Design a protein around this motif. Structure first.
Motif, mmCIF file in Angstrom:
data_model
loop_
_atom_site.group_PDB
_atom_site.id
_atom_site.type_symbol
_atom_site.label_atom_id
_atom_site.label_comp_id
_atom_site.label_asym_id
_atom_site.label_seq_id
_atom_site.Cartn_x
_atom_site.Cartn_y
_atom_site.Cartn_z
ATOM 1 N N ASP A 149 -10.551 13.790 1.650
ATOM 2 C CA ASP A 149 -10.395 14.990 0.847
ATOM 3 C C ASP A 149 -11.553 15.957 1.092
ATOM 4 O O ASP A 149 -12.681 15.534 1.358
ATOM 5 N N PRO A 150 -11.296 17.262 1.015
ATOM 6 C CA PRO A 150 -12.378 18.236 1.196
ATOM 7 C C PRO A 150 -13.422 18.116 0.098
ATOM 8 O O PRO A 150 -13.121 17.757 -1.042
ATOM 9 N N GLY A 151 -14.662 18.425 0.457
ATOM 10 C CA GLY A 151 -15.772 18.293 -0.456
ATOM 11 C C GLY A 151 -15.810 19.406 -1.477
ATOM 12 O O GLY A 151 -15.056 20.390 -1.418
ATOM 13 N N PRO A 152 -16.712 19.259 -2.452
ATOM 14 C CA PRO A 152 -16.824 20.276 -3.510
ATOM 15 C C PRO A 152 -17.323 21.622 -3.018
ATOM 16 O O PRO A 152 -17.146 22.622 -3.725
ATOM 17 N N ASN A 153 -17.935 21.687 -1.839
ATOM 18 C CA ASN A 153 -18.468 22.930 -1.301
ATOM 19 C C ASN A 153 -17.464 23.678 -0.434
ATOM 20 O O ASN A 153 -17.828 24.678 0.193
ATOM 21 N N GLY A 154 -16.215 23.220 -0.383
ATOM 22 C CA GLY A 154 -15.207 23.834 0.453
ATOM 23 C C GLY A 154 -15.177 23.342 1.883
ATOM 24 O O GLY A 154 -14.359 23.832 2.671
ATOM 25 N N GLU A 155 -16.042 22.398 2.243
ATOM 26 C CA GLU A 155 -16.030 21.838 3.584
ATOM 27 C C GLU A 155 -14.754 21.039 3.816
ATOM 28 O O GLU A 155 -14.288 20.310 2.937
ATOM 29 N N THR A 156 -14.184 21.183 5.010
ATOM 30 C CA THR A 156 -12.938 20.525 5.377
ATOM 31 C C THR A 156 -13.207 19.549 6.511
ATOM 32 O O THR A 156 -13.884 19.895 7.485
ATOM 33 N N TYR A 157 -12.680 18.334 6.384
ATOM 34 C CA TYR A 157 -12.846 17.287 7.387
ATOM 35 C C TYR A 157 -11.466 16.865 7.879
ATOM 36 O O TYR A 157 -10.850 15.956 7.320
ATOM 37 N N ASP A 158 -10.982 17.530 8.926
ATOM 38 C CA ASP A 158 -9.745 17.118 9.573
ATOM 39 C C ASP A 158 -9.976 16.271 10.814
ATOM 40 O O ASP A 158 -9.048 15.587 11.258
ATOM 41 N N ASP A 159 -11.182 16.300 11.382
ATOM 42 C CA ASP A 159 -11.491 15.442 12.518
ATOM 43 C C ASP A 159 -11.705 13.994 12.098
ATOM 44 O O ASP A 159 -11.409 13.080 12.873
ATOM 45 N N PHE A 160 -12.217 13.769 10.890
ATOM 46 C CA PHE A 160 -12.412 12.413 10.402
ATOM 47 C C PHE A 160 -11.074 11.719 10.182
ATOM 48 O O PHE A 160 -10.098 12.336 9.748
ATOM 49 N N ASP A 161 -11.033 10.426 10.491
ATOM 50 C CA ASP A 161 -9.869 9.591 10.238
ATOM 51 C C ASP A 161 -10.333 8.307 9.567
ATOM 52 O O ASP A 161 -11.403 7.783 9.889
ATOM 53 N N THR A 162 -9.526 7.804 8.638
ATOM 54 C CA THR A 162 -9.873 6.621 7.869
ATOM 55 C C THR A 162 -8.869 5.505 8.123
ATOM 56 O O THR A 162 -7.692 5.752 8.401
ATOM 57 N N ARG A 163 -9.356 4.270 8.039
ATOM 58 C CA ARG A 163 -8.535 3.080 8.191
ATOM 59 C C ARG A 163 -8.880 2.091 7.088
ATOM 60 O O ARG A 163 -10.026 2.016 6.642
ATOM 61 N N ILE A 164 -7.881 1.330 6.657
ATOM 62 C CA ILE A 164 -8.062 0.327 5.615
ATOM 63 C C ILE A 164 -8.366 -1.009 6.272
ATOM 64 O O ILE A 164 -7.625 -1.462 7.153
ATOM 65 N N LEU A 165 -9.456 -1.645 5.846
ATOM 66 C CA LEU A 165 -9.878 -2.913 6.426
ATOM 67 C C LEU A 165 -9.529 -4.119 5.568
ATOM 68 O O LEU A 165 -9.290 -5.201 6.115
ATOM 69 N N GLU A 166 -9.489 -3.970 4.245
ATOM 70 C CA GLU A 166 -9.208 -5.101 3.369
ATOM 71 C C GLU A 166 -8.795 -4.590 1.999
ATOM 72 O O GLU A 166 -9.526 -3.808 1.384
ATOM 73 N N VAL A 167 -7.635 -5.035 1.525
ATOM 74 C CA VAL A 167 -7.185 -4.789 0.161
ATOM 75 C C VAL A 167 -6.963 -6.137 -0.506
ATOM 76 O O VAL A 167 -6.241 -6.988 0.024
ATOM 77 N N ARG A 168 -7.593 -6.337 -1.660
ATOM 78 C CA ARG A 168 -7.555 -7.634 -2.322
ATOM 79 C C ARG A 168 -7.528 -7.432 -3.826
ATOM 80 O O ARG A 168 -8.374 -6.718 -4.371
ATOM 81 N N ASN A 169 -6.562 -8.061 -4.489
ATOM 82 C CA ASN A 169 -6.471 -7.975 -5.939
ATOM 83 C C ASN A 169 -7.569 -8.813 -6.580
ATOM 84 O O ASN A 169 -7.792 -9.963 -6.194
ATOM 85 N N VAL A 170 -8.252 -8.234 -7.563
ATOM 86 C CA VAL A 170 -9.373 -8.873 -8.239
ATOM 87 C C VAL A 170 -9.048 -8.980 -9.721
ATOM 88 O O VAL A 170 -8.691 -7.982 -10.356
ATOM 89 N N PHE A 171 -9.173 -10.185 -10.269
ATOM 90 C CA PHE A 171 -8.893 -10.447 -11.673
ATOM 91 C C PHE A 171 -10.192 -10.657 -12.441
ATOM 92 O O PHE A 171 -11.134 -11.270 -11.931
ATOM 93 N N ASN A 172 -10.230 -10.147 -13.668
ATOM 94 C CA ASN A 172 -11.358 -10.335 -14.569
ATOM 95 C C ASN A 172 -10.837 -10.759 -15.933
ATOM 96 O O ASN A 172 -9.728 -10.393 -16.332
ATOM 97 N N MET A 173 -11.648 -11.534 -16.647
ATOM 98 C CA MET A 173 -11.266 -12.087 -17.939
ATOM 99 C C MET A 173 -11.795 -11.188 -19.049
ATOM 100 O O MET A 173 -13.005 -10.961 -19.145
ATOM 101 N N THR A 174 -10.889 -10.682 -19.882
ATOM 102 C CA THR A 174 -11.231 -9.797 -20.983
ATOM 103 C C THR A 174 -10.860 -10.448 -22.309
ATOM 104 O O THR A 174 -9.972 -11.302 -22.380
ATOM 105 N N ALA A 175 -11.556 -10.024 -23.366
ATOM 106 C CA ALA A 175 -11.360 -10.634 -24.677
ATOM 107 C C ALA A 175 -9.951 -10.394 -25.206
ATOM 108 O O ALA A 175 -9.318 -11.312 -25.740
ATOM 109 N N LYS A 176 -9.442 -9.171 -25.068
ATOM 110 C CA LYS A 176 -8.156 -8.814 -25.659
ATOM 111 C C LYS A 176 -6.995 -9.054 -24.698
ATOM 112 O O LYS A 176 -6.089 -9.839 -24.995
ATOM 113 N N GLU A 177 -7.009 -8.384 -23.545
ATOM 114 C CA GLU A 177 -5.867 -8.452 -22.640
ATOM 115 C C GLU A 177 -5.754 -9.819 -21.978
ATOM 116 O O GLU A 177 -4.646 -10.341 -21.808
ATOM 117 N N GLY A 178 -6.881 -10.416 -21.603
ATOM 118 C CA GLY A 178 -6.854 -11.650 -20.846
ATOM 119 C C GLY A 178 -7.223 -11.425 -19.396
ATOM 120 O O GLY A 178 -8.396 -11.207 -19.080
#
Ligand SMILES: [Mg+2]
Ligand SMILES: [Mg+2]
Lengths: 63, 220, 86
Positions: C35-64
């Motif tokens: 996404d473009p930065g707060p100063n109006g700079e645009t990055y169309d040359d940059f490209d992104t790739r996803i390396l790892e997506v993993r579901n993470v669980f945490n224990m909460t008092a109410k929801e569980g």
């Protein structure tokens, strides 16, 4: 936008590398002053390790 | 445009352009108790090269290296002021807070001697405003907070690529400071001397910027 | 009635996403320019790739079990500058 890693190197090293890379198109004003006037030691991050063993300090007593 | 480049690049070709070598000397620093330091027990490991020696458990800072560093620090401070740069005075010490705050007012520059918020320099848009111009130089008259830890602005400034000119005592960490000046930051005469030296350094830079501007105006 | 039948035919079909490291994992799937930065700079040359997506669980008092998704991506322009974050 920039680099926010403290331990990679000095502020000068990261700034000129990003400019040479082609991401930072607006040269910061302080950069020109740095090239003309460099400090005695380049500000590179170093971990303050604690001295173990027989190694002592090199500071001499004033007598 | 070309003349605008000329005026910006004019002072870069002279090392003594602002004639700052006459402001201070080794004798002047010595009478300000700048060569004194903390006890030998509190000597930080990175300050060993800058120490002339230890006198009965009291470290003595080598002023010859202080003069070399201070000469570049004042020279670097003036040039960034000449180019219309924002200078911030940061000092978390509750004995010179008013003096440093008044010092910045006379120079026309900004000071921050109060409590430093966490997301100030890093998360600037939320703390200050939508579009904020970050300071182009930070001056540390004291690199330690009141709990004897390194100041947050020292670490944050390196993240944001902002050069820092800071006085480092014998127990400070000059690792991240780009223009360290090993000296004494505790005795009142020492702290007063540093403020006055930065007072005249800024004022000369502001004035000589105006003088060259007047010459440029009559050039064309 | 023909219009409604045509509408159904335009909903069953699903766009074939960019094939990552495998058919179902998100490893190696590109997300486009950052996404473009707060100063109006645009990055169309940059490209992104996803390396790892993993579901993470945490224990909460109410929801569980409080399921949270963390991802690790890397961006780069191809000219020698690249970076990673989580
Ligand atoms: Mg001290
Ligand atoms: Mg499959």
């Amino acid at each position: 936008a920039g680099s926010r890693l403290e331990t990679v190197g000095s502020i000068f090293s990261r700034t000129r590398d990003l400019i040479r890379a082609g991401v930072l198109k607006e040269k910061p004003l302080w950069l020109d002053i740095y090239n003309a006037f460099p400090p005695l030691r380049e500000p590179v991050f170093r971990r303050p390790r604690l001295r173990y063993g027989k190694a002592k300090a090199a500071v001499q007593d004033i007598f | 445009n070309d003349l605008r480049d000329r005026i910006l690049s004019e002072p870069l070709k002279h090392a003594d352009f602002f004639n700052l070598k006459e402001l201070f000397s080794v004798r002047s620093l010595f009478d300000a108790r700048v060569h004194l330091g903390h006890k030998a027990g509190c000597r930080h490991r990175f300050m060993e090269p800058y120490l002339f020696g230890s006198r009965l458990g009291q470290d003595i800072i080598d002023l010859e290296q202080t003069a070399a560093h201070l000469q570049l620090a004042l020279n670097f401070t003036a040039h960034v002021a000449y180019r219309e740069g924002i200078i911030l005075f940061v000092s978390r010490h509750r004995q010179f807070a008013h003096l440093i705050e008044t010092t910045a007012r006379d120079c026309g520059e900004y000071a921050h001697t109060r409590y430093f918020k966490g997301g100030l320099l890093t998360n600037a848009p939320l703390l200050l405003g939508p579009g904020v111009r970050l300071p182009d130089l930070i001056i540390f008259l004291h690199t330690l907070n009141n709990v004897f830890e390194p100041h947050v602005a020292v670490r944050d400034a390196a993240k944001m690529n902002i050069p820092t000119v800071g006085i480092v005592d014998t127990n400070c960490n000059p690792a991240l400071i780009t223009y360290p000046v090993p000296g004494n930051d505790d005795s009142p005469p020492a702290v007063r001397l540093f403020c006055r030296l930065f007072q005249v350094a800024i004022s000369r830079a502001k004035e000589k910027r105006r003088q060259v501007e007047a010459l440029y105006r009559l050039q064309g | 009635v023909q219009q409604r039948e045509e509408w159904d035919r335009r909903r069953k079909m699903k766009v074939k996403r960019e094939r990552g490291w495998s058919g179902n994992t998100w490893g190696g799937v590109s997300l486009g320019p950052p996404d473009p930065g707060p100063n109006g700079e645009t990055y169309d040359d940059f490209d992104t790739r996803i390396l790892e997506v993993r579901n993470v669980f945490n224990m909460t008092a109410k929801e569980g079990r409080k399921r949270s998704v963390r991802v690790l991506v890397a961006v780069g322009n191809g000219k020698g500058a690249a970076g990673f974050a989580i």
